[model samples]
Every structure is written in structure tokens, then in C-alpha cells.
Target: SDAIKMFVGQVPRTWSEKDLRELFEQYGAVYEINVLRDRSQNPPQSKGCCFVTFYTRKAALEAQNALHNMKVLPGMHHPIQMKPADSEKNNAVEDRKLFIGMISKKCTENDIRVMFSSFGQIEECRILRGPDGLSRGCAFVTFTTRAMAQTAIKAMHQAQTMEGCSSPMVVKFAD
Candidate 1:
């Protein structure tokens, strides 16, 4: 099983454990939650970081994908960063990869390959699957060059709907 833990950063100082848990719970069944607090203050403030444990690896990954770089809390200037607790597994760098969301369940690797093949050479393309072996309706595509990745985003972002796919696609640099 994948690691069930995640490192959360860029949290709002004012956020409490309840606030964090509430935010994370939206993604999946949260097993545990902890928001780091400053111990030196009279009323220890939040350290703007936390840890969240989910019941399943899929749930944890879903939370990371959905909440990463999102402003879940109001009046927050920075989006929260979520990553696998195990550093070795969090290897994909943002600039070279593109996250394609709202994908068609019927979409195939061949379909994806044909769509982005013209832009540049692909390093990797993966449609994340659940334990049930069904499409999660999202994919990660990596290009050999950032320029190619940017070009693909500009040309295809929210502009292309593949065969059997009614929803507009979302293309962005992976974070």
C-alpha cells in the first residue's frame, strides 16, 4: 500500500486542527490530523504546517492532488502544499510535468499519446487508476522540455474535448 501520510505546508497561522481536519476531510476519510503549534508563545500559534493521515493511499493521493496549491482557507495569500510524507516517492518535478484533469473515463493512453505527440517528445504519461482498476479521470503527462509542456497547455488547455468526452479538459503544469 502507498504511504497514508502527507506533509502539509503553507497553512494559515490562524488555522486550527479542526480547521485543517475540516479542509482535508473533504478529500477523503481522514484517519488522523495534526497542526503544528508554536510552543514558545503564551497562546501557541500555528506553525503553518500539519500532517494528515488518510484511511487509504488513494484517499491520501486524492487529497494531495485536489488540495495542493489550493487556497482552502479564506484570506490566505499562499496555496497549501501537500506531498507524500516519504520524500523518496515524491519525485516528479513540476516544470516538466502537466496535470490533465476532468479527463474522459474512456480515454486511453493511445488517445493521450496522439493528442500531445505533436507538441514534443513525451517522457511519461500515466492515467492514475484506483485500486478497483478504474480511471480516476485524471492523468499526468511529462514532456522532455518545459517549452513543449507550456506550448501544449496554451494550445490545449480547456480547449479540447476528446472523443466520448463531453467535459472540457484542464491542462496545467504539475505541482
Candidate 2:
């Protein structure tokens, strides 16, 4: 059976890896768990978010349905939010889509397509335009694979100087 991944958000900062694993084991066998962290600090610390991989899709779904908006940590003000991890499915749209902001107002869909096509097979490309028929300075590009989207991000993120351009291109995974 394919493994299923779930997102755990708004966790208490003091929660440990063992605590997460134990809490989730109630739904089913947990294949893996990750407590997200910020590494810029002298000592890395939890970002109060995590991912849990379940041994079965049923287990993952059950956990998400039961845990969403439920407070797992005592004395915490905000309830935990659970959802299927963004990149879990074999071909989830969010995995392939990327949000591009700060683009040149003059940029066209074809321009973006041409710039990013080299990274992978593009499913669609669009430069958002306002009701005034002017560029919104943002766009979305969809690729065929999460790997390709990630590769494009690594190759282009914050690496452009935008010389002679109206705006610089900023690339990131679309939520």
C-alpha cells in the first residue's frame, strides 16, 4: 500500500518527536514523522509544524478527519489543524504548481513558458491580469512533476537581478 502523508500545524513548541509519534499512533502505525524547524538560529528549533507519514491511506484520512481543529496539547490556545500533506498524492496539483510574484508587468504567458519550459514539461502558464487589462505582476506555472517544480525553484529562486526589467521574478511553491 502507498504511504500517506499528513500535515500537523500549530503544534506546541515544546512538543518532542516522541510525543508526536505517540499521539499519531492512535490512528495507525506511523511510518515516519518530522518536526519542522528553523535552522538559522544557533541551535535549530521547532517551527511548530510537522509532517506525519502513515502506513496506510485510511489511517492518514482518519487522523486528518479526527484531528483537525482539535487541540492535542493541553493549555494551548489554538487547535491543531490537520490536512493531507501538500505533496502526498502521486500527482497532486499543489505539488506541480508554483507561484511566481514580482514579475515584469510587460511579461507575457509565453515569456514565462519559455523561461521555465527548460526545467520540465509545463502543464500550464498564466500571467495574471487585472480588470484594467494590465499585468498583475504575478503568475502561476504548473509542471508535470514535483521534482521539476522543485528543480525550477532551486535554479531560479532569488537568483535573478532583473536588470533592465520592470520587476524581478520571485519563485516559490504555491500553497
Candidate 3:
């Protein structure tokens, strides 16, 4: 019902929200665009992603298709999937909880469970850790039932304090 936002990964954190707004506005009108920031004691140094919302679905779609696979910055690219946010909201049985975008880099699998476990029993929480055994800031937090998965998504998607920012969590069903 509203405009859409997206994430472009692994860019420098140097670009300001204003920079993003100007960049996207060149193609079409932009409502809100932001370079996501993490406010941790050890603040993340890499600019992992940016979000932009347009005035209409047509604009968003054009932006999505036009921007897909386009390099927004050196060593960084769009996620390539202009998926509808509501597509993530499904009634079918979904036992896995896959999240998109960046969480705090320091967060662990246990951290994911701690955050999502309130909705139900989390069967497992797995963060794709790094070579140094650090979390890469994305995660799969699995729940025991479809209802639990939906409920957790509903609740945590609204949670502002999640991993240090108020941005939409983009939680979705997984196989």
C-alpha cells in the first residue's frame, strides 16, 4: 500500500542518507532514503546497505528493475529481488525463520534465539559466521510451528530496539 525500500550491500558507510536520496531521486522521486547505521559500542565500519522508498509502486518497480544488479557503489550491489513485503506474510506451514539485511555484526545465533524465542520454542538459530567465527550480521532463526514463525515476525518486525535500529526486520518464511 506504500512505497518500497531496499538494501544494497557491502558499500562504504561514508555515504549519507542525503546522498542516497539524491542518487535515487535522479531516477525518480524518492520519499525516504537512508544509509543504515549501527549504533554499537564498536560501531560497524562497513556500510552494508541503504533503503529508498518511492511515491508509487510503478516507481518502486521501475527502480527495482532498473536498479537490480546495478552496482550502487564499488564492491556493492542490490539484493536483486524486489520482493513484496507481504509475500513474507504467509499462512502456510513455515518452520524456518530467515531474516534479511544486516543485524548487528556482533550478534550470535544465541542472540537470535533470545530475540525471537519469546513467540515460541525456537528449534535452532543459525548465523552464517565468518572465517574468524564472527556473525556476518544475517541469520536464520527457526521456530517450531508456522504460527510461531508468523507471530514472531509480526512482533519482531515492529520491534524498534532490534539489534540496535528501528528499521523493518524483513522477516520471512523459509523452507
Candidate 4:
């Protein structure tokens, strides 16, 4: 079962864990969540970073769709980014490869190879990174044959064991 990783705005320097959970719980399935805090300071401030794990890509997408523009909390806007939980699915395809979206943000080139290589021999794979040099929650996967790419599309896009969120995996061919 593939997973989706997402994040909310950097946790507030003064927000509590319970407050943070309340904000994320409104979405749907929330496999895991955390609000980084400091321990040295008397009132440890937030690292301004948080992590959220969804059971499925779809749920994560839904959460993004629902909260992308909505103000779930005061002074907090949703910074939703979805990608395959494992950094193995988001890679670039060389020479007539397929593109898949809704991959985990952590997906790496090797992870893409492992996930798609079984479909056929992969000559090349590339995963686009954002300006910050991290997964943009999307990738282009090239397969040896169109048939293999098609098979992966069907396999990866179908609904499955996503229980922590309400987003859907948006997979399709890349330009």
C-alpha cells in the first residue's frame, strides 16, 4: 500500500500538540502528525515545521483540495503538498517514459526504479525537485514499454488501503 506525506504550515511557535492535532483531524484520515518543538528554551518554540501522513494518495489529495485555499485556523494557511510516502515512486522517465502524480514527497530516483523497474527494464528515471530541492509531489516514470506504463497506471491509480485521509491519487501521463 502506497502512502502520501503532507505538511501544514510550520507549527506556530506557541501552538500546542493538541491544538495542532485538532487542525489536522478535520481533514479525514491522519496516519501520523507532529509539531516540532524545542526543549532547551523555557517555552520551547516551534521549528515551524510539521509532518502529516495519509493512508492513501487520494485522501492526501482531498485534504489538499479542501484546505489548499481554506483557512483551517487563524493565521494558518494550508501548505498542503502530496507525494508517495516512499521516495521510490517519483522519478523522471527518459525516452518515452510515463509520468505519475500524487507521489510521496520523499520519493527518490532509486525508489522510482524499484517501484517501476519490475514492470520492465527502465533505461532512465528522473524525479523533478522543487526549488527547495525536494519532491514536488509529482514525477515522470518511464517504462520499457507503453504496456508496462499502462499497467502501472492502473495499479497505482486504483483505490486501495488509504485510511488516514480523504485525498485521491491523481496519476496521468506527463507532457
lDDT at 103, model 3: 72
Report the alpha-carbon TM-score of model 4 versus the true structure.
0.41
lDDT of 1 by residue, 1-175 (tens): 4447788988888788788788888878888888878789698788888888888888888887887885555667778798867643443456789999878887787788888999999989999889998888889999988889999999989996755566889899986
lDDT of 3 by residue, 41-68 (tens): 5865535566667777677776667666
Which candidate leads the pack in TM-score? 2
Model 1 Cα shift for residue 174 (angstroms) = 34
TM-score each candidate: 0.46, 0.52, 0.41, 0.41
TM-score for candidate 2, residues paired by index: 0.52
Clash counts for all predictions: 0, 0, 0, 22
Which of 1 and 4 is ahead in TM-score?
1
Model 4 residue 30 CA deviation (Å) reads 1.8
Writing each residue's lDDT as its tens digit, candidate 4 over 14-62 gives: 6776775676667666777767566896867777756677777677777
Q: State the lDDT of candidate 2 residue by residue for 77-138, as single tens digits.
A: 78889887777647878779999987777888998999899999999998889999898888
Poorest stretch of ten by lDDT in candidate 4? 158-167
Better of 2 and 3 by lDDT: 2
Best by lDDT: 2
- Please give me the total number of clashing residue pairs in predicted model 3: 0
